[PDB]
Design a protein around this nucleic acid. Sequence first.
RNA 1: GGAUGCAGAGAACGAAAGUUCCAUGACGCAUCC
Length: 117
Amino acid sequence: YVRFEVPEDMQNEALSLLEKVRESGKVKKGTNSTTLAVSRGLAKLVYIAEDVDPPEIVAHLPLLCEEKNVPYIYVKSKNDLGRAVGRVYPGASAAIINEGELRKELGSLVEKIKGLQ
RNA sequence: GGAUGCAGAGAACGAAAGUUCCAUGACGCAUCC
Ligand SMILES: [Ca+2]
Ligand SMILES: [Ca+2]
């Protein structure tokens, strides 16, 4: 249930900004903490995996992000989301809570994502 | 065992070889049935 389709280069930009934010920022991984972070108005930018089965697990996300005005982006695999923070483990969804040092980069990314809508 | 919440990384058995679960939330900590 993709709301939009992100092109490959933009997906790579987001997945790379994720690894750069790892150090100086704060990132959560998993559907529980990500949903909480969006509901509490903490998530700067959320990532949703495309290969989630059953897809109903992450389906509630885009509408909640629209409710709370949180930019969401679809990434190809949940394994591409496994390096988000801490232990290497697959993640159906993640969320950058603090941009950290990469402020303008996240700004450009959310501009490009809004461009897709 | 089951339900609910809090938090979010490895956890239980084993001398270890290994066996079994875990961000689709294990392990826990409570309250209840
Ligand atoms: Ca261990
Ligand atoms: Ca032991």
